[PDB]
């Protein structure tokens, strides 16, 4: 299958073991902004669900399908690869909806649907939008979509912006300087200090922050889920040119994302931006190896290149330069191994 081709077996085992825990489904469910917005988007656009056929890609608990059933869906197909599918089925029976919600255990790209569907619902967004590579499973499910059918959500905007956080940057060398001592219980550890520094810089930092650290308006890279193909997400080139609103040392790029549910009645937004209330996605920051001085008015340009890997994530390559000075920096980061800092 397509999933097994692009995914390492062990990554897949671990991944669906994780979502098999009720505690993890719960964690997502009790994110009120996330779950609330999804419900609000499905019900306010009741015309899109009334007596229609729906596909829930990765139903988990079944929560989003129940929201579709609340909006008057005739049939809802609920696909889920983890053992959570069993628990989803139990909830379908207990809520008296076996006639309307059908739960299909298996990966969306390996199972077969009886019929095609009018609309597909899913919550496949990881942190920095793309982590987990579930967007590809989402797009792949359009093989079951009827022509002119809809996607909920319909688009996704990833936002990038430069930040100054002098303390975050210096903390990396503070931690790595554990190794810089000539007699740790008699042992000179200093030869590994450089290797410790490299390790910490490979980690994107998942936490939130005060918006005052942002030095320019975000640049967005848009994915239209109606138009895009799986292959569009194997290599994601995000070019940027920031018109700098503040002067200082730029230490990295801050990431967040929004998605839109473009319905018949109205358009509903779910944002994970640092201006909005905190979600379980937090935000993500990738440091440069070396900071860049920028003046207000300057242009900080470069590329964020996300290269998909078979561990359901991306290798992040970031190159950036201040156009007026020539000063430049870069970093290579491992999206699957982030440092969780708001812990």
């Amino acid at each position: 299958s397509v999933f097994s081709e692009r995914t390492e077996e062990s990554s897949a085992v671990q991944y669906f073991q994780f979502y098999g825990y009720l505690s993890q489904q719960q964690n997502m469910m009790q994110d009120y902004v996330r779950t609330g917005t999804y419900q609000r988007a499905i019900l306010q656009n009741h015309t899109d669900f009334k007596d229609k056929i729906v596909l829930d890609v990765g139903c988990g608990s079944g929560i989003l399908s129940f929201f579709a059933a609340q909006a008057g869906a005739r049939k809802i197909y609920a696909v889920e690869a983890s053992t959570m599918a069993q628990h989803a089925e139990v909830l379908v029976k207990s809520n008296n909806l076996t006639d309307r919600i059908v739960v299909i255990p298996g990966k969306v790209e390996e199972v077969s649907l009886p019929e095609q569907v009018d609309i597909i619902i899913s919550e496949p967004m990881g942190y920095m939008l793309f982590n987990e590579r579930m967007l590809e499973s989402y797009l792949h499910a359009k093989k079951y979509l009827k022509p002119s059918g809809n996607m909920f959500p319909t688009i996704g905007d990833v936002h990038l912006a430069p930040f100054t956080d002098e303390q975050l940057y210096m903390e990396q060398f503070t931690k790595a300087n554990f190794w810089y001592q000539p007699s740790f219980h008699g042992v000179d550890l200093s030869a590994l200090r450089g290797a410790a520094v490299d390790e910490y810089f490979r980690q994107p930092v998942v936490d939130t922050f005060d918006i005052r650290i942002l030095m320019a308006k975000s640049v967005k890279y848009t994915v239209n889920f109606l138009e895009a193909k799986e292959g569009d997400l194997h290599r994601i080139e995000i070019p940027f040119k920031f018109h700098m609103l503040h002067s200082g040392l730029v230490h990295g790029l801050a990431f967040w994302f929004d998605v839109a549910f473009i319905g018949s009645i109205m358009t509903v937004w779910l944002s994970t931006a640092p201006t909005e209330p905190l979600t379980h996605w937090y935000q993500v920051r990738c440091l440069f190896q070396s900071p860049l001085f920028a003046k207000a008015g300057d242009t900080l340009s470069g590329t964020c290149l996300l290269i998909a890997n078979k561990r359901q994530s991306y290798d992040i390559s970031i190159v950036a330069q201040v156009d007026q000075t020539g000063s430049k920096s870069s970093n290579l980061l491992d999206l699957k191994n982030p440092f969780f800092r708001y812990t």
Binding site: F18, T279, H280, K336, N337, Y342
Partner: peptide, 9 residues
């Protein structure tokens, strides 16, 4: 990653 979805308070 190991814990793809991070814990919310």
């Amino acid at each position: 990653g190991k814990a793809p979805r991070k814990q919310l308070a």
